[model samples]
Target: QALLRILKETEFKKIKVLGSGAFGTVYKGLWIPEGEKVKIPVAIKELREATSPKANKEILDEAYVMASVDNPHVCRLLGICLTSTVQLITQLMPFGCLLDYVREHKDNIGSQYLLNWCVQIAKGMNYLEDRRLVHRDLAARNVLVKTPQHVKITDFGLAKLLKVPIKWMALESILHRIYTHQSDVWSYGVTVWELMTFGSKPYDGIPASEISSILEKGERLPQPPICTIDVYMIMVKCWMIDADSRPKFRELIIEFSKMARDPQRYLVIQGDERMHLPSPTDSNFYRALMDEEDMDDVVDADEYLIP
Candidate 1:
């Protein structure tokens, strides 16, 4: 139902390069329509390999997918520009990707703001699910935030366009690169981890070669310090090995929607509660000492010394 319109390259006054990936390079631009005094801001992406059959199909597929939906949480495709190089024009996101946004504003991000963002992402993905279009990549980096807390899903392409880490992918994708709606759910969990940790690297300090074996053994990335126990429950559901057991985006929207309404339910923990507690080596008398206690005085100097 969506028509792909080809516009003049001159219509977009190139601003600066926004970013680039395996699929293409995206640039910020200002659309100067005929007779229009105001220059509207837009994002233009140059299709990486426009001449190849696979690349052409992949680019067109994304354009069609973006054009089909008109949800606030999903990025809007303005049109495509035809020239020596193929380009796509879309709504400009002033705040950039959600990943970078969270990192840049981590210090001031309130619990409610974070929860609201998570809910909005769920709503967008649910819309895609309703249309039976798999996003394939749903990580925080693929999500863009507009001014005033608006999040938009972008970057639809073939499976090969995936630049997200293998650790963020589901077990199925790791084993055989098979991506489905459920696979996206797994990535969503990792994205939540990223947001909660203020953009910490996944599987921190672990080598890529051993990630698969570790996952196969049922080990998962540890919960972030700021993530509340209640919210972590939702992330746990997303990583379920049985793809059927993973919570659907619709169901997640409902759960997060409730918390968003009552922000008190979404608490951001300071750190492990045991952090301030006494060490295991401390006796009851020494344990009673206040923060950063010194038990060295109680025991013999040589006895407390390490081997």
Candidate 2:
């Protein structure tokens, strides 16, 4: 078993609700650790009731996986609380998730900054790939912004563990339930699209039930109105039907690093007339659908369509 520190519920003082969904509520909290006079700011993930022992075991397994990761671009799991309900204490990200951050500041943000974030995400994914861990969930919502320029990947090992609806999943993942580094690369393409579109949801007008079929037909998320052809090409390569054809995270890091350093050279915006502005309710609708198991049931039926 992985050595994990046990935390007491009383040790944390909840400030307010950061966010909440089907899984549970996240609280902006302050922790007064043992042998410390100063309080440390943290995000407390208060999970929903685990009805079975198996559910509790899954939570602990996720905690163990998170504890093993040590990277600046990955969220650090501080400890675990197993009092009345399980809670996960983690480093606080003041700016919140990347999706919300991009949407909130889309006007002021520059293409260079967005490119820089893509590079950072690839670097983080490279670390996970090198360690032989697949980030089954790699989306803008799962990345927390520490500063204007820095973001950290979170929710590691929780996609399969939680069995959450995956709108950003690769085609192979949806069909065969097979997740690998290459599948993660596919999701990375969607995540980059999210950044380019200022947090626009992928497959904006398509029903969740129809996504698998759409991919089967060789259709993909259209290029963002402001995305350059060069930057959009990366997303194109990532969405390839043959997973082996996608570029590895290491190659992506190098590719994005060059673009980040010379944004003007690579990120020349070529507006797309076919692309329309996303609805304001798009993010809210996406969030609501995630909380409902109905979408999962609909998408899961695709498994029968294959083989």
Candidate 3:
């Protein structure tokens, strides 16, 4: 009831799958407004499971959160349709998710492109922080590439207030299950790492069981191949043992801006593919079975944890 406009399901045309994740599947669709000549491109989100009262509410809540956010770097929600099925419509990002783009085009795109993507995502997160919301899942997969090197943040389905990727969460959040704006900064750092690595999974080859223990001991992801020292420093800041020590998204934007001045200088020839490099456990593996007392502060979604 918070000013959400309801659209008819019939309005969406040419529906085709955009992508699917743990939360839901996204589809590309076409819609022509009442007075528009050209059709509008839209992305529709539908839960993977059939709608239940609880699921419906979660979708509605995500819609509200999406509606509250207003920033060029963030995806714009168009409306919701509850006619035949519950669908959340948003602006279509044609280039697809940032992870896919970097994976496919890392060798082709300039350093400026990667840095700009980081800046764009940081700007979007800064906007969300200003609104007192935390995007727990700040990762390359959650960001969508628009055009001409522009990127926007999306995928709020599992982020009403939590993260989806375990490796992206900060130390405090990981041990205690707590999430904060600073926790998001931690995730942002991981996003930068993903950018540097061209979408390699964090802690790959290290069993998920060992990730928490590794971080508890201050072990962070090894610097990505070709990642500059300056940019790597920023990621280090985000991985500080104390979440409070992490720089806010606002501060990150300034750092990004400074790099933008000499973006190309940050470039290096990415060495052999990351898959060929040593695994995390081979390097400094970062802790142990945390006690229930230690995890008392645990407060985020369970799905965010490793099995």
Best by TM-score: 2
Evaluate model 2: give its lDDT: 0.77
What TM-score would each prediction reach against the true structure?
0.80, 0.83, 0.80
Pairs that collide in candidate 2 are none
Evaluated at residue 116, the lDDT of candidate 2 is: 85
lDDT of 2 at 193: 93
lDDT tens string, model 1, 1-307?
2355456767776666778878789876666654534455667888776454546566677667666676878876767765556787776666678888778766666667777888888888888887777878778898997643567788654345424477788988888878888888898888888888888888978888788888888888887776677888889889988888999988898988898887655756443222232222443322322112221222221122223
**Decreasing lDDT order of the candidates:** 2, 1, 3
lDDT of each residue in 1-307, candidate 2, tens digit only: 2345577767776776789987899987666666644466677898796645557676777778777777778876777887567788887776779998789867667767777899899989999897788998899999997767688899876656554445688888999998999999999999999998989988877888898999899898898877778988999999998999999999999999988877767655443222232333444433442333322222211121133
Clashing pairs in model 1, backbone N/Cα/C closer than 3 A: none
Residue 87 shift from truth in candidate 2, angstroms: 0.4
State the weakest 10-residue window (summed lDDT) of model 2.
296-305
Better model by lDDT, 2 or 3? Answer: 2
Our model 2 lands, by Cα RMSD against the true structure, at 11.5
lDDT of candidate 3 over 222-271, digit per residue (tens) = 98877888889999999998878889888889888888778767757543
Q: Judged by lDDT against the true structure, how good is candidate 3?
A: 0.71
What value of lDDT does candidate 1 attain over all alpha carbons?
0.71
